[PDB]
Amino acid sequence: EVEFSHEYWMRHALTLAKRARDERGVPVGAVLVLNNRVIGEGWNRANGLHDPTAHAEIMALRQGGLVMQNYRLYDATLYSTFEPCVMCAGAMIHSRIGRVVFGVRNAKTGAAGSLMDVLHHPGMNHRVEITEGILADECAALLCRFFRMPRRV
């Protein structure tokens, strides 16, 4: 897509979601971007990592803190193929990231407007901007484990 755009980074998250094919649930892929540069990548690997927190968004935030040598990732934007859960939404507030961009909503456990809104809770110390709908048609297909293979040349 157009370079350094929301749809551009969403395609990177869609590719990473394929690594979560052998996980119980919707495959989620996440990428953490700061100043048009990748500082963190992640996919769902709870069973593969024996970590109850090994979500796509969390692995991207965990890798970003190692790259930035700081648990605070100011002005960073996190691209996820799925609406964050209550655990992932809480991690973005503590990371103080600038924005989360997810494609399709999680009408079962999503914490960005569906089941609740943890990112926009009035009692929070940080506000993370929310942008939804980026590559929504392809991200919605991830709910049924569908991936795209378009025509080449």
Added chain:
Amino acid sequence: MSEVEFSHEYWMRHALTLAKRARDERGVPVGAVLVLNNRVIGEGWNRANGLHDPTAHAEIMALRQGGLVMQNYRLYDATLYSTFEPCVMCAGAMIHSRIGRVVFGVRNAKTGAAGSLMDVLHHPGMNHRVEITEGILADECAALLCRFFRM
């Protein structure tokens, strides 16, 4: 009073000792220990700045260490003792851990997600319900908010 072995107050004192290792972190020192069948399977304290990990909270390390020993990201029937009420990020990890009970001492009137800022653990839309027990060693845990330790 009397603190029986393998009891809630017994494990809370173990978490209070672990909290000393998080004294050099921005915020109140929190200590957590994960217990399954009266055996320690996970320990943790605040190490966000020391490890460059925004998720390096006390309860999360116990769940992360617990998942490593249990060889399973699902820690059924496990009890998590923390010196502080969990935040929104830690409380979300306990739902995914499928632990049986969380035991925290004092409430977190700033970032707590177990009654203070919200109650996510008992939300009806969750796939798992974690039992809540609060107030265990509250006096020794409330002093931890002001960096006070008993001698």
